[PDB]
Amino acid sequence: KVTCLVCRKGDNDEFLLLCDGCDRGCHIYCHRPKMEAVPEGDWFCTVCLAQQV
């Protein structure tokens, strides 16, 4: 049931990156700055980045 934070759609799930800190997602093609591929390491969405210290 994951949708992209930017465009609010869940289509093209092969491009729909999942946050390692929560249930949120983002299409690599909606990401700014440019994200050409799904990263191998952990990715954190902006809501999770806001919880860091």
Partner: peptide
């Protein structure tokens, strides 16, 4: 990281 396709 992983995608919604690779998860399900």
């Amino acid at each position: 990281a992983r995608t919604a396709a690779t998860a399900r």
